[PDB]
Amino acid sequence: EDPLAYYENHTSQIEIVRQDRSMEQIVFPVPGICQFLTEETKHRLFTTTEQDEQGSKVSDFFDQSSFLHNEMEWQRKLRSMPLIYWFSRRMTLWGSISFNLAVFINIIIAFFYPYMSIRPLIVALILRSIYYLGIGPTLNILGALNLTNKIVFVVSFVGNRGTFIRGYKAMVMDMEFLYHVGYILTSVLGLFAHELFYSILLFDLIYREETLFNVIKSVTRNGRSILLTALLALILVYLFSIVGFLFLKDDFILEVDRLPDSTERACDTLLMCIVTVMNHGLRNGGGVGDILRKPSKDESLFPARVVYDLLFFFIVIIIVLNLIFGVIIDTFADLRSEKQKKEEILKTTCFICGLERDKFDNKTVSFEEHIKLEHNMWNYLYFIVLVRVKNKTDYTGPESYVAQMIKNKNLDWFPRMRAMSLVSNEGEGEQNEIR
Amino acid sequence: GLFAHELFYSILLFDLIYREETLFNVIKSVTRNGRSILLTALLALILVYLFSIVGFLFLKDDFILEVDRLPDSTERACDTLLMCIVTVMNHGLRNGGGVGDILRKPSKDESLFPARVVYDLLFFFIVIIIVLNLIFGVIIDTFADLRSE
Ligand SMILES: Nc1ncnc2c1ncn2[C@@H]1O[C@H](COP(=O)(O)OP(=O)(O)OP(=O)(O)O)[C@@H](O)[C@H]1O
Ligand SMILES: [Zn+2]
């Protein structure tokens, strides 16, 4: 309604650096296409963009400009389609419905197999269906609902994300799409082949919960270290088994509960000795000595047995096994430190210029205004889109300069540790004093 | 405690936490990431459910448990999926060696001996050394974060 309000909303400003290392302020109109940028995509980019070797996110932010433009174009195209857009807007609802259905199906299977808010209402309806129709019909209905809801969720996911915008190859390469396809296949298997396949769907908890994902990362980050420690444990077990087979063959007597003698020799062969050690010594707190024949102090090999058991216990149980847990704790610490560093950087430094919030103290302009009005990464994206959408025939000085810098793949036009609102005022003031 | 039953006085011992700040910080070291601990427990439950399904499908006869009947001494603890899940979730988690510490001892001549060995080893590595230790790792991480803050 208000022309001034409309122009203020559709007008943006940025700061650039020219070839002579001089800072200039450019005021431009926001292209209409820029209005179709999703807040989810903006947040994802802001929280995922990484720093380069020089500590700048500008390289990645610029490299994502084409993807952002294509995503905005796809969103504009989709918004003309009401039904598909409406379905795409409810991805969270579809995912929640699918997860609840999977949980209910798994609970029913656990509590009844073998056989033959609105959540309380859903539970009551499920109980009534079980009482009236039966477990089988209830499971069939739940499986059909889960399959339909997952199909709707996949349609919504593709529509909203525009993964096809990068091509079918990119969509296939995407891990999330493959995960959704595998989930659909698992649901189909549960519905038709055997209901027990529904148990696999419980792994969707990891996908849904980020905290559990971080906990799992604490183990998977140093998975190579864990596997190497396990291999070292296996080598030590092999050596101990060799020693036992050479000198303690008769002490490997194991009780057995034969199905319709009660003891057997478990070290007649090297492979059997290795298997017995690797299993029992590792699964017993006291080590291999907890299953070997109990010796007597009068035996000549009693000191040897004591030394063997003690060495196994100290070397394998207290050290080797605890190394995996130590690696897990170290990974926990490293993840926490990295996350804290990243959050501190993101919250106390400027995305474009990288200046800290401590140069802006005691000045007309604060960090908040500097990030909302002067170095807006989104305003830079809008300027990039304008340069790419504007006919070359009506470029201005700075528009042509930025277009040429883009043609040459040069980022030196983004400011870096410099702000027109920070040092330009004092610089002009000292210049006036000098003059 | 004064009127209904004197045993209610035991609840008053929780005032120690209120009185002592150090114990309160120790409890905070666990309660700060309570959601993480609960999610880890749910993951453990899901893994136990999968292992119980596998055992019921292929190792039904090996779930024999001794019982001290009040005035046969063994019973089958995996005749149903729910019973198998309960037995695993209890014994495997409360035994250092895992679920294998309560299953029937096999013989090397049995055709399923390698399968039993693999099952027990997988349960031990996946659930006992990793999943259970994740809660303790979370507690240690919370300790470190609290001290740093
Ligand atoms: N250069 C930057 N440095 C730090 N944070 C930034 C930067 N540019 C943007 N942000 C933050 O990223 C988010 C994007 O701000 P944006 O102007 O898009 O907000 P908005 O409220 O959605 O917009 P508007 O109200 O102007 O229509 C905000 O949190 C903003 O503070
Ligand atoms: Zn800036």
Author numbering:
A (entry chain B): 2111 to 2226, 2260 to 2403, 2449 to 2623
B (entry chain A): 2333 to 2403, 2449 to 2526
What do the study's own words say?
Inositol-1,4,5-trisphosphate receptors (IP3Rs) are large, tetrameric cation channels that serve as the primary intracellular calcium (Ca2+) release channels in nonexcitable cells.
In the first of the major states, the BTF ring is intact, ARM2 is extended, the JD ring is intact, and the pore is closed. In both the resting and preactivated states, no density peaks consistent with a bound Ca2+ ion were observed at either the JD or CD binding sites. For example, the abundance of the putative resting state, which closely resembles the ligand-free state and shows no evidence of bound Ca2+ ions, is negatively correlated with the concentration of Ca2+. In the resting state, a portion of the wedge loop, including Thr926-Ala943, inserts into a cavity surrounded by the CLD, ARM1, ARM2 and ARM3 and adopts an ordered conformation. By aligning the maps based on the strength of the density for the wedge loop, we found that the flexibility of ARM2, as assessed by the local quality of the density, is inversely correlated with the strength of the wedge loop density, indicating that the presence of the wedge loop stabilizes ARM2 in the extended conformation. IP3 generated in response to extracellular stimuli can bind to the ligand-free channel without altering its global conformation, yielding the low-energy resting state.
